[PDB]
Amino acid sequence: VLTESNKKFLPFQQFGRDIADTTDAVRDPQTLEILDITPCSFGGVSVIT
Amino acid sequence: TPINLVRDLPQGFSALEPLVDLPIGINITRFQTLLALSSS
Ligand SMILES: *[C@@H]1O[C@H](CO)[C@@H](O[C@@H]2O[C@H](CO)[C@@H](O)[C@H](O)[C@H]2NC(C)=O)[C@H](O)[C@H]1NC(C)=O
């Protein structure tokens, strides 16, 4: 899920890495803006019966 | 970074951001500064 990012990437910085070497923030090549990256919601499904 | 001292390196901490990456790939083994410019 792409969202507007309030992170202040420095002019030379493009990607934002997390602990797992995963990009949690990117900079759009066309427009010079930084977008947060959040994975689509996931979780287990339990059947109560 | 503005430093009042001109004779000794100051004390503190600051990080240098990159300015430009030149893709040239030469030997640089020796280098010299270019100052502003001996019989008498
Ligand atoms: C970069 O240029 C330098 C020029 O000095 C080369 O350095 C020489 O490399 C040969 C390797 O066969 C050596 O026999 C010489 O002794 C080196 N000269 C000096 C003054 O040290 C070099 O080949 C070029 N490439 C690299 C990886 O250095």
Side-chain angles (χ1 to χ4, degrees), chain B residues 26-29:
Chain B
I26 65 188
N27 288 248
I28 298 178
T29 312

Side-chain angles (χ1 to χ4, degrees), chain B residues 4-27:
Chain B
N4 59 310
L5 266 74
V6 300
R7 290 193 60 176
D8 176 42
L9 206 151
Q11 190 270 329
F13 189 77
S14 91
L16 323 180
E17 305 97 349
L19 319 183
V20 68
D21 298 4
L22 309 211
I24 47 154
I26 65 188
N27 288 248

